[PDB]
Amino acid sequence: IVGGQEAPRSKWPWQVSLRVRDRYWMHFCGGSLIHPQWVLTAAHCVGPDVKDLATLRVQLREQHLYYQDQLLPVSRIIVHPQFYIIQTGADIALLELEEPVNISSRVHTVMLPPASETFPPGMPCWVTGWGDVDNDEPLPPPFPLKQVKVPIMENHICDAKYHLGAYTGDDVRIIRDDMLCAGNSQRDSCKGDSGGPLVCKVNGTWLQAGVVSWGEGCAQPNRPGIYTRVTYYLDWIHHYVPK
Amino acid sequence: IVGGQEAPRSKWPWQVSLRVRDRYWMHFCGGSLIHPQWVLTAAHCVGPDVKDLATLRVQLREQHLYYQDQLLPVSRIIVHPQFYIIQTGADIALLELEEPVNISSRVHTVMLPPASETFPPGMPCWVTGWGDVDNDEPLPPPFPLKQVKVPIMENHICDAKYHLGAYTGDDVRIIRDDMLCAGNSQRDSCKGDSGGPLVCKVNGTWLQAGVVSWGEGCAQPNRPGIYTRVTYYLDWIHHYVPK
Amino acid sequence: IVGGQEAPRSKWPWQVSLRVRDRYWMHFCGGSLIHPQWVLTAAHCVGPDVKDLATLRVQLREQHLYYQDQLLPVSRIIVHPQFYIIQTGADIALLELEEPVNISSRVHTVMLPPASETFPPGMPCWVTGWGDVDNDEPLPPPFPLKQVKVPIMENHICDAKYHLGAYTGDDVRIIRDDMLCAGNSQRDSCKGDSGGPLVCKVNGTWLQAGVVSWGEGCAQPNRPGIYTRVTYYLDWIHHYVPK
Amino acid sequence: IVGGQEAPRSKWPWQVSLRVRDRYWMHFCGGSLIHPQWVLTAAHCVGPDVKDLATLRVQLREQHLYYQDQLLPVSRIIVHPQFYIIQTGADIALLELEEPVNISSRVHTVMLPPASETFPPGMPCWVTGWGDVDNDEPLPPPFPLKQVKVPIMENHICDAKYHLGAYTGDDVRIIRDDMLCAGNSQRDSCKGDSGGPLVCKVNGTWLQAGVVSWGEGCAQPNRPGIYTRVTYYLDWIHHYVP
Numbered sequence: 028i029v030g031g032q033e034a035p036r037s038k039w040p041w042q043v044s045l046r047v048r049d050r051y052w053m054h055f056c057g058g059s060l061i062h063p064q065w066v067l068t069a070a071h072c073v074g075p076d077v078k079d080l081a082t083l084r085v086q087l088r089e090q091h092l093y094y095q096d097q098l099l100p101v102s103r104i105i106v107h108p109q110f111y112i113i114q115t116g117a118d119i120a121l122l123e124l125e126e127p128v129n130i131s132s133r134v135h136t137v138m139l140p141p142a143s144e145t146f147p148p149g150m151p152c153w154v155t156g157w158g159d160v161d162n163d164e165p166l167p168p169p170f171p172l173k174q175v176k177v178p179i180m181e182n183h184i185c186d187a188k189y190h191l192g193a194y195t196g197d198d199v200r201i202i203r204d205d206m207l208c209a210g211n212s213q214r215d216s217c218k219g220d221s222g223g224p225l226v227c228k229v230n231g232t233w234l235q236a237g238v239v240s241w242g243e244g245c246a247q248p249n250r251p252g253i254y255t256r257v258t259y260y261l262d263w264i265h266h267y268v269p270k
Numbered sequence: 271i272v273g274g275q276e277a278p279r280s281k282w283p284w285q286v287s288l289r290v291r292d293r294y295w296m297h298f299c300g301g302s303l304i305h306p307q308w309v310l311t312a313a314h315c316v317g318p319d320v321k322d323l324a325t326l327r328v329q330l331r332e333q334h335l336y337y338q339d340q341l342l343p344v345s346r347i348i349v350h351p352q353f354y355i356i357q358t359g360a361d362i363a364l365l366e367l368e369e370p371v372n373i374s375s376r377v378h379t380v381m382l383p384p385a386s387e388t389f390p391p392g393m394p395c396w397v398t399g400w401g402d403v404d405n406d407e408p409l410p411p412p413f414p415l416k417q418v419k420v421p422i423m424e425n426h427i428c429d430a431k432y433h434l435g436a437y438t439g440d441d442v443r444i445i446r447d448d449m450l451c452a453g454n455s456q457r458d459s460c461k462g463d464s465g466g467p468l469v470c471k472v473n474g475t476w477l478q479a480g481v482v483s484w485g486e487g488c489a490q491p492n493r494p495g496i497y498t499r500v501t502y503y504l505d506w507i508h509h510y511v512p513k
Numbered sequence: 514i515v516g517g518q519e520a521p522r523s524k525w526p527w528q529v530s531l532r533v534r535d536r537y538w539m540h541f542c543g544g545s546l547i548h549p550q551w552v553l554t555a556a557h558c559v560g561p562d563v564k565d566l567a568t569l570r571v572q573l574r575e576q577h578l579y580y581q582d583q584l585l586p587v588s589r590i591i592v593h594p595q596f597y598i599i600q601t602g603a604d605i606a607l608l609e610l611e612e613p614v615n616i617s618s619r620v621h622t623v624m625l626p627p628a629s630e631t632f633p634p635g636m637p638c639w640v641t642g643w644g645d646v647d648n649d650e651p652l653p654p655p656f657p658l659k660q661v662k663v664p665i666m667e668n669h670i671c672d673a674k675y676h677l678g679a680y681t682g683d684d685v686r687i688i689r690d691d692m693l694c695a696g697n698s699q700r701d702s703c704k705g706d707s708g709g710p711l712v713c714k715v716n717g718t719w720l721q722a723g724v725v726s727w728g729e730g731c732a733q734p735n736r737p738g739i740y741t742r743v744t745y746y747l748d749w750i751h752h753y754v755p756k
Numbered sequence: 757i758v759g760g761q762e763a764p765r766s767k768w769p770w771q772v773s774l775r776v777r778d779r780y781w782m783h784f785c786g787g788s789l790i791h792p793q794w795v796l797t798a799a800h801c802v803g804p805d806v807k808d809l810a811t812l813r814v815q816l817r818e819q820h821l822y823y824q825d826q827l828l829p830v831s832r833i834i835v836h837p838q839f840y841i842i843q844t845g846a847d848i849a850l851l852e853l854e855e856p857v858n859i860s861s862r863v864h865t866v867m868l869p870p871a872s873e874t875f876p877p878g879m880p881c882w883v884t885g886w887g888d889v890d891n892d893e894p895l896p897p898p899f900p901l902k903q904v905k906v907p908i909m910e911n912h913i914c915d916a917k918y919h920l921g922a923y924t925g926d927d928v929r930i931i932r933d934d935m936l937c938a939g940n941s942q943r944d945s946c947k948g949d950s951g952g953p954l955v956c957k958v959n960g961t962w963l964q965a966g967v968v969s970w971g972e973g974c975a976q977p978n979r980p981g982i983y984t985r986v987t988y989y990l991d992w993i994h995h996y997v998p
């Protein structure tokens with residue numbers, strides 16, 4: 028997370044860390060608890076190929092990575108079928124836990140947004156995670172969970188921004204309707220934050236607007252972070268997660 | 271180049287090396303002389319952003335990289351406008367040299383194929399470059415130019431391979447018509463070969479069938495290398511390069 | 514530590530971690546609390562040059578590195594004067610804390626041996642630390658303190674091991690009287706354990722026999738770890754550390 | 757080599773590069789041709805342990821590393837018996853080629869100094885090699901052989917310099933008699949240069965004064981580069997080299 032601060036222990040009870048087996052259970056992406064037995068994340072996190080589930084684990088909200096682990100094995104991995112190698116569309120996936128987790132004040136689900144929520148500019152949102160604090164700059168030990176408020180940028184304005192300084196044709200769309208834009212040259216998510224949540228407060232309630240997906244660099248000028256727009260995949264999500 | 275051998279001095283007179291300004295003029299991509307004053311290469315090589323020409327140079331056919339350099343500046347770069355970050359389609363670009371090069375038997379252009387050539391399986395083709403000789407294994411000093419014969423795979427068969435062991439839906443197309451597939455688990459191009467040429471011997475003549483673009487891993491099972499199909503972009507190329 | 518296991522919380526209350534100011538207070542060496550206000554360590558850890566104390570901190574017994582840090586400033590550093598760059602003899606040093614620490618059962622000093630103790634082969638000894646778990650393999654997160662029982666090898670037998678497969682002359686001494694040897698191809702200390710303690714259980718009491726100093730590789734055949742023999746420097750130590 | 761320039765093709769005809777097998781014959785140290793069949797180098801280069809000779813090769817003077825290789829296998833490796841792990845004394849070794857090399861204007865031997873030459877301060881010397889051009893900064897391709905003139909620093913003055921900023925006792929010698937000091941914060945040899953030659957011109961003749969050995973950092977303040985003094989090991993060298 029670029030330009031933020033360490034999150035208080037009571038914030039983001041839905042944040043999860045995904046780990047892969049490599050000398051230790053190493054963090055590679057974030058995710059969010061959207062149902063006691065389901066985790067929402069980015070498809071490219073559990074890609075490219077179909078993964079052996081024995082090499083993957085889920086860690087529920089912990090303030091510091093690795094220290095008080097209570098790894099949870101995964102029962103099923105579901106990746107949106109529109110997703111494919113080298114491409115950013117349909118960057119969304121589901122992880123089914125082998126069993127429901129205990130729900131509490133410190134650990135519980137984040138609400139999915141209603142289909143009509145567009146999360147227009149001005150909406151107060153935050154992205155959280157354990158990723159890098161700047162380009163090629165990893166989060167130092169003890170690995171505290173970080174947060175940062177990021178401004179939303181209307182999709183069309185975002186798409187135009189991504190054309191500033193690029194060879195791409197103005198008439199060629201870079202930012203798609205299933206995406207969402209947030210962040211500036213001071214605040215942003217970054218490598219390691221992928222699959223993590225972007226939440227916005229709407230009339231007192233936290234709603235998950237996006238899933239950390241990609242961006243050109245981190246906190247780079249005219250290059251807001253790009254998230255997968257959750258509302259666009261609610262029907263798909265509801266085909267697996269109980270409402 | 272994975273699984274090949276050093277190329278004889280008299281072969282591949284159209285191969286070029288692109289250099290970026292670092293502690294020295296470092297090789298980052300390949301390219302090809304398709305006209306005395308024009309180099310064909312991959313859009314992603316001159317990407318992501320609009321490049322400052324002062325940081326780039328072109329090196330014509332040499333047997334070893336850096337040894338007998340005669341660097342050429344670049345007049346302008348033209349990247350296919352349908353090209354964009356994190357997307358592999360329309361991966362093709364043009365470099366105009368400040369001056370036309372002296373054509374010789376040791377250094378001359380490669381012929382582009384007629385729109386009708388499909389380069390079907392069985393065609394004998396070679397891909398050349400100074401890239402990695404295997405996954406995460408760079409070409410070692412003295413950096414000889416390498417070549418490897420690579421089998422062509424029909425687009426649909428190729429598309430089906432890429433769906434093997436992947437979450438992508440069978441109806442979702444991974445390999446597109448502007449693409450071409452070649453290579454196997456023994457022979458292929460790799461990191462650093464990018465933008466280089468795939469040339470096939472057709473009725474006694476060498477024709478450039480493709481530009482090294484991407485692939486999952488290098489020489490990985492059921493994941494042949496993907497090339498930008500040259501015939502698909504002949505009208506665009508001819509819009510800039512004289513006949 | 515190579516080949517050991519995580520240490521129980523109630524063991525090695527004298528182990529200390531030394532920290533250097535980087536992107537965080539990074540561990541670089543171990544040390545031991547031999548007096549409420551003094552830490553014993555290796556000269557090469559505080560070498561080669563006179564260190565600026567502002568870049569150094571001491572961390573008393575903790576189960577995991579960085580997690581529950583309570584860093585302590587260092588008042589002064591005293592390196593044995595016979596010590597010098599590229600030489601392994603007299604590798605011993607002292608750190609005076611700014612304040613004496615509160616002694617408890619979870620955190621207290623280790624007893625120094627009497628001048629007469631030779632720590633002969635067969636003695637049960639443990640070496641502890643947060644160093645590499647094998648050659649070029651750092652301790653992975655969450656960085657638990659490790660311990661490993663290491664066999665003692667008599668000085669002369671050790672000296673002869675070190676001449677095996679080496680060009681050094683049989684008459685040229687490699688292991689000196691101020692040294693002690695422990696470890697085998699299965700168990701040993703390694704990079705990062707340096708300055709830490711080798712303690713042996715003698716007649717119901719734990720005595721610090723050595724300070725992790727050097728060795729050829731880690732757990733390499735016929736190359737036991739070399740420690741600074743504590744008894745040899747008792748008069749120097751007592752010239753500074755109260756009784 | 758720090759602070760120098762690329763060497764002309766006609767200089768240092770005695771410079772050699774030592775290569776170890778690792779994906780390619782990779783340079784790890786330098787050496788010098790002191791006899792048609794013998795190479796002088798540093799002992800720590802052919803250390804830590806007794807090496808399997810099949811993993812080692814010698815390359816005679818090339819302007820650029822790797823490009824026009826003609827690797828030569830080694831017949832025997834002789835390391836001064838006083839040398840041992842983690843210590844810089846007797847840092848000198850000999851490599852016997854399986855056969856004499858052809859001698860020419862471009863490739864030939866460097867003269868060993870007479871026992872009485874002390875190479876006092878003021879003497880014009882150069883150190884050559886393919887090592888790093890600064891700390892943690894490797895020589896970039898095409899890897900040209902570099903050279904640099906380094907000033908000599910009298911042994912005692914050198915030893916005192918190495919005590920500046922260190923915990924070591926003044927009465928404890930750091931720089932020994934079998935060593936020699938040269939360089940300053942602008943000019944010095946460095947990692948990759950080890951085993952290579954330090955030569956000084958004495959009354960028109962080039963003499964090998966030292967073998968690149970060690971130093972604290974590269975071109976660091978009050979830390980001249982340290983070479984093995986050749987004169988000190990002439991008798992040992994003469995037990996093997998005709």
Ligand SMILES: *[C@@H]1O[C@H](CO)[C@@H](O)[C@H](O[C@@H]2O[C@@H](C)[C@@H](O)[C@@H](O)[C@@H]2O)[C@H]1NC(C)=O
Pocket residue numbers: 858
């Ligand atoms: C030493 O010089 C002589 C004369 O210039 C060369 O012939 C040697 O080359 C070697 O011997 C010749 C006959 C031929 O076999 C060639 O391939 C050999 O390299 C040369 N010796 C060396 C090792 O360069």
Ligand SMILES: *[C@@H]1O[C@H](CO)[C@@H](O)[C@H](O)[C@H]1NC(C)=O
Pocket residue numbers: 129
């Ligand atoms: C769930 O909560 C109960 C009650 O506190 C506890 O006993 C049980 O172990 C918890 N399950 C997990 C997986 O922690």
